[PDB]
């Protein structure tokens, strides 16, 4: 099939446009790849796609061990086969740095080097938002470049940009949003992602019922598994609006913040508004015990797992990157009392262990993030230094400044409701063993 699909899109588009696609395609794959590298790999990839439309696909492998971008662990794969490389997954770029230049910078760069300007743009935009579906990336960059080409040669560039930008605002927002939401999905995988979104919703609207939010976590998860990856037909645009309707139908009346978000002029704005919403103050209800019962074994439903996750989230002041991090191992541990000779026995024993481990994790995590959510950043720094002073009596102002600096930096990246999963997974591990 595809052994003729690579060749089909080549002929249908032609070498140049097929090179623009490949540029976007590979920039997504190598988030850390430099412009020269990515462009070089593309130079040669198209090269063979033109000729062989395996014999020279091998030429690449070898040469890759270089002018080409490098995935983490390429040195290993170069041990040989040898195509251990096509198995190396890339980690998403969780810290975009893309900033659009002023109109003059764009037009000047464009008048001088039309090809290079568009290659620099496709490469930079695609490496920063590489998790948005290819179809969306390809579409926004062509519409964008079409705007640049058109406006920079118009009777009045300025007003042209004012108007064109307003008409691309939607597709622009959809692409960066998609990158974010789809990058969290790829980071966690479908199961953790689903729980993650359930946790965030529980934190945003603690007064709701599992029933009000579970359908929401389910829906977005389905939308992500269906639309994060599409080569030419984007469905994120077809799916999100109705998703905002489910969101509003279920939480519009349960929460003032949501009621307002549901007033936005577009589904994109409503969505963005509910995404940025921080974890609300938790009503702090009674504690909840681990779901140590045969009901968590249900292959057909995670009902019990979801209910626990939901109830934990709305009672525990702790960021979702923390909850998601400890829930995966914990729910998986319990799950080991399912396919055994006696489930009740394996639960009564495992119970006290997981409980203490979970509490230890929650306690240290609540310490790592103490005061961050309830205060403005500066007012947070102050209370933080104060807590550290109390714990480190012989600490010199300099040693304290380093600790406040280190801890506050960590908290600004891993205590918000939308902290970067991959980056915080590592940092959280490091910080737990701290103090
Ligand atoms: C970079 C690496 C990873 C590291 C290795 O050493 C060499 C290498 C080759 C990968 C290639 C080049 C040949 C065509 C392949 C196998 C791609 C597709 C199967 C074909 C393809 C190419 C352009 C647009 C498309 O829509 C489809 C996927 C990865 C491509
Ligand atoms: C460092 C994050 C975990 C925090 C400790 C929570 C206690 C969990 C108890 C036992 C571990 C069960 C092993 C499950 C394997 C999943 C892989 C993983 O640890 O992420």
From Swiss-Prot:
SMART domains xrefs: ALBUMIN
The keyword Transcription regulation belongs to this UniProt entry's keyword annotation: no
Gene giving rise to this polypeptide: GC
GO biological process, one term: vitamin D metabolic process
Known partners and oligomeric status: Associates with membrane-bound immunoglobulin on the surface of B-lymphocytes and with IgG Fc receptor on the membranes of T-lymphocytes. Interacts with LRP2; the interaction is required for renal uptake of GC in complex with 25-hydroxyvitamin D3.
One cellular component term from this protein's GO annotations in UniProt: extracellular exosome
PTM annotation, UniProt: Allele GC*1S is O-glycosylated at Thr-398. The trisaccharide sugar moiety can be modified by the successive removal of neuraminic acid and galactose leaving an O-mceeN-acetyl-galactosamine. This conversion is thought to produce a macrophage-activating factor (Gc-MAF). Only a minor proportion of plasma GC is O-glycosylated. The potential N-glycosylation site predicted at Asn-250 is thought to be nonglycosylated.
GO MF term list: actin binding; calcidiol binding; vitamin D binding; vitamin transmembrane transporter activity
Organism, scientific name: Homo sapiens
Family as reported in the entry's similarity comment: Belongs to the ALB/AFP/VDB family.
Domain Albumin: 1-170, 171-356, 357-435
Gene3D superfamilies: 1.10.246.10
Keywords noted in UniProt: Actin-binding, Disulfide bond, Glycoprotein, Repeat, Secreted, Signal, Transport, Vitamin D
Subcellular location: Secreted
Listed name of the protein: Vitamin D-binding protein
Biological role: Involved in vitamin D transport and storage, scavenging of extracellular G-actin, enhancement of the chemotactic activity of C5 alpha for neutrophils in inflammation and macrophage activation.
Disulphide bridges, residue numbers: 7-53, 65-78, 77-84, 107-152, 151-160, 182-228, 227-235, 248-262, 261-273, 297-338, 337-346, 369-415, 414-424
Entries under InterPro entries matching the protein: ALB/AFP/VDB, Serum_albumin-like, Serum_albumin_CS, Serum_albumin_N, VitD-bd, VitD-bind_III
Domain of life of the native organism: Eukaryota
Tissue occurrence: Expressed in the liver. Found in plasma, ascites, cerebrospinal fluid and urine.
């Amino acid at each position: 099939y595809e052994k003729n699909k690579v060749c089909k899109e080549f002929s249908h588009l032609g070498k140049e446009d097929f090179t623009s696609l490949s540029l976007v395609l590979y920039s997504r794959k190598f988030p850390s790849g430099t412009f020269e590298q990515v462009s070089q790999l593309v130079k040669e990839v198209v090269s063979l796609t033109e000729a062989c439309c395996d014999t020279r696909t091998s030429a690449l492998s070898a040469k890759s061990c270089s002018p080409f971008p490098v995935h983490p662990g390429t040195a290993e794969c170069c041990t040989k086969r040898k195509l251990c490389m096509a198995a190396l997954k890339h980690q998403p770029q969780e810290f975009p740095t893309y900033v659009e230049p002023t109109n003059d910078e764009i037009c000047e760069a464009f008048r001088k080097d039309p090809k290079e300007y568009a290659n620099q743009f496709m490469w930079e935009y695609s490496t920063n938002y590489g998790q948005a579906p290819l179809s969306l990336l390809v579409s926004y960059t062509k519409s964008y470049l079409s705007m640049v080409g058109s406006c920079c040669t118009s009777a009045s560039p300025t007003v042209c940009f004012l108007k064109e930008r307003l008409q691309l605002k939607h597709l622009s927002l959809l692409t960066t949003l998609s990158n974010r939401v789809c990058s969290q999905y790829a980071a966690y995988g479908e199961k953790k992602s689903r729980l993650s979104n359930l946790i965030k919703l529980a934190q945003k609207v603690p007064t709701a019922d599992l029933e009000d939010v579970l359908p929401l976590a389910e829906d977005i998860t389905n939308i992500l598994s269906k639309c994060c990856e599409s080569a030419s037909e984007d469905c994120m645009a077809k799916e999100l609006p109705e998703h905002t309707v489910k969101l509003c139908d279920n939480l519009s009346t349960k929460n003032s913040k949501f009621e307002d978000c549901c007033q936005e002029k577009t589904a994109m704005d409503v969505f963005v508004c509910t995404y940025f919403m921080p974890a609300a103050q938790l009503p702090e209800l009674p504690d909840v015990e681990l779901p140590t019962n045969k009901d968590v074994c249900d292959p057909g439903n995670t009902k019990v797992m979801d209910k626990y996750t939901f109830e934990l989230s709305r009672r525990t002041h702790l960021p979702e990157v923390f909850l998601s991090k400890v829930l995966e191992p914990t729910l998986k541990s319990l799950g080991e009392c399912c396919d055994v000779e006696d489930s009740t026995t394996c639960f009564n024993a495992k119970g006290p262990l997981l409980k203490k481990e979970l509490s230890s994790f929650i306690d240290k995590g609540q310490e790592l993030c103490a005061d961050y959510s309830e205060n403005t950043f500066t007012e947070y720094k102050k209370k933080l230094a104060e807590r550290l002073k109390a714990k480190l009596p012989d600490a010199t102002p300099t040693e304290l400044a380093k600790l406040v600096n280190k801890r506050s930096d960590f908290a600004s990246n891993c205590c918000s409701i939308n902290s970067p999963p991959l980056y915080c997974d590592s940092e959280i591990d490091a910080e737990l063993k701290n103090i």
